[PDB]
Design a protein around this ligand. Structure first.
Ligand SMILES: [Mg+2]
Ligand SMILES: [Mg+2]
Length: 250
């Protein structure tokens, strides 16, 4: 039927990356919330004030906490957004109909919370970051990420239009990758993975690896999708999300 989709962006991005998908879900009758996480999009915070992934997720937690009784949402997380999903699902699991991991980090419950990030780090040669800028800052020593135009063009948006890449160049902002996701909370939610097959930021092989590691309830494959499937495969993506809405409810 009709769901409430809560869309959670990835590193260096913001609510704006869902600007093509949201109207599509809304024309399907759904309610759609596309948050800015902390120090993302036009959030007024700067990355230097964020100490943890939990603090980065604050707007998501705040929004879920405000949800009235009976209201349940389908979380949709992109890239690093998948970790925001795990954080949110472990605090407000009673409010989550399902979580969708769009080419995202899917943590598990048997390994430590950062396992998929550590493993992603270990499989990723530093050359792959291209012109991405890594700096350090202090709060209370934290490494910041800032994607450069080459990385955006060559590893994230390579199958997107020039207006998509230019938009990201105009909006991306510094981010950061910064103990256990519980079986009772996060572990209990239905999870859906959307594989993006031409992804060069999180390669399909890593995406398949995470599914192997912690199998979700449904796996969709988006052929021809780079990492920003919501911009190049928006229509197909909305059709998967409708299938999800129809499956996970009453
Ligand atoms: Mg925004
Ligand atoms: Mg392009």
């Amino acid at each position: 039927a009709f769901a409430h989709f809560v869309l959670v962006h990835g590193a260096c991005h913001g609510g704006w990356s869902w600007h093509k998908l949201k109207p599509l879900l809304e024309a399907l009758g759904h309610k759609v919330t596309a948050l800015d996480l902390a120090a993302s999009g036009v959030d007024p915070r700067q990355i230097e004030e964020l100490g943890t992934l939990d603090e980065y997720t604050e707007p998501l937690l705040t929004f879920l906490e405000a949800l009235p009784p009976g209201e349940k949402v389908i979380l949709v997380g992109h890239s690093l957004g998948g970790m925001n999903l795990g954080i949110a699902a472990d605090k407000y699991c009673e409010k989550i109909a399902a979580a969708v991991f769009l080419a995202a980090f899917m943590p598990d419950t048997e390994h430590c919370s950062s396992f998929v990030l550590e493993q992603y780090n270990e499989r990723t040669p530093a050359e792959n970051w291209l012109d991405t800028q890594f700096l350090t800052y202090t709060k209370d020593e934290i490494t910041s990420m800032f994607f450069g135009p080459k990385f955006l063009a060559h590893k994230l948006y390579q199958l997107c239009g020039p207006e998509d890449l230019e938009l990201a160049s105009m909006l991306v902002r510094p981010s950061s990758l910064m103990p256990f996701f519980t079986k009772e909370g996060y572990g209990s939610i239905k999870k859906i993975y959307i594989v993006c097959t031409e992804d060069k930021g999180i390669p399909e092989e890593f995406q398949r690896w995470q599914i192997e590691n912690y199998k979700p309830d449904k796996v969709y494959k988006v052929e021809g999708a780079d990492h920003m499937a919501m911009l190049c495969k928006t229509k197909e993506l909305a059709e998967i999300l409708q299938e999800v809405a129809d499956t996970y409810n009453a």
